[PDB]
Design a protein around this motif. Structure first.
Motif, PDB file in Angstrom:
ATOM      1  N   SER A  11       0.854  -1.207   0.000  1.00 11.51           N
ATOM      2  CA  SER A  11       0.000   0.000   0.000  1.00 11.51           C
ATOM      3  C   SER A  11       0.888   1.256   0.000  1.00 11.51           C
ATOM      4  O   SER A  11       2.092   1.163   0.246  1.00 11.51           O
ATOM      5  CB  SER A  11      -1.006   0.006   1.122  1.00 11.51           C
ATOM      6  N   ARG A  15      -4.920   1.024   0.579  1.00 16.09           N
ATOM      7  CA  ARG A  15      -5.621  -0.279   0.790  1.00 16.09           C
ATOM      8  C   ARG A  15      -7.116  -0.025   1.007  1.00 16.09           C
ATOM      9  O   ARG A  15      -7.910  -0.772   0.425  1.00 16.09           O
ATOM     10  CB  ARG A  15      -5.030  -1.090   1.946  1.00 16.09           C
ATOM     11  N   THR A  47      -2.604  -1.427  -5.693  1.00 17.72           N
ATOM     12  CA  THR A  47      -2.853  -2.036  -4.355  1.00 17.72           C
ATOM     13  C   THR A  47      -3.982  -3.042  -4.568  1.00 17.72           C
ATOM     14  O   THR A  47      -5.154  -2.660  -4.606  1.00 17.72           O
ATOM     15  CB  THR A  47      -3.096  -0.964  -3.272  1.00 17.72           C
TER      16      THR A  47
END
Ligand SMILES: [Cl-]
Ligand SMILES: [Cl-]
Length: 129
Positions: free
Chosen positions: A50, A61, A69
């Protein structure tokens, strides 16, 4: 853009952060100082793949889409790039959603470790607000 302390306090006040969910303006200024050093363009990569973005280091995230991500929930419905603007509007709108989600400002590691239980009013001392 690198904000001045009092400049950012005034921008944050205009956008409705002063006492938002019971957190005084000093808390938000302190979190921005230690998360990004008041720099809207700050990015930081995490071990989980992330990335944290912008003045409040919002994470890819859960909160924004950066296209790299896997399994981002994109809960603020925004490209992470939007959080790096000199206009803090997108960062503020997304922060309001984060600090509502349950754990309050504890979502910000730098706030929990460097701001929580300190004299946060010091961060807005001397400002015309
Ligand atoms: Cl305060
Ligand atoms: Cl809370």
């Amino acid at each position: 853009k690198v904000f001045g302390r009092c400049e950012l306090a005034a921008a944050m006040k205009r956008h409705g952060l002063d006492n938002y969910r019971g957190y005084s303006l000093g808390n938000w200024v302190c979190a921005a100082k230690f998360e990004s050093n008041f720099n809207t363009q700050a990015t930081n990569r995490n071990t989980d793949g992330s990335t944290d973005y912008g003045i409040l280091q919002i994470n890819s995230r859960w909160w924004c889409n950066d296209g790299r991500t896997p399994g981002s929930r994109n809960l603020c419905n925004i490209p992470c790039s939007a959080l790096l603007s000199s206009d803090i509007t997108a960062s503020v709108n997304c922060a309001k959603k984060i600090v509502s989600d349950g754990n309050g400002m504890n979502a910000w590691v730098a706030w929990r470790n460097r701001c929580k239980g300190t004299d946060v009013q010091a961060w807005i001392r001397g400002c015309r607000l």
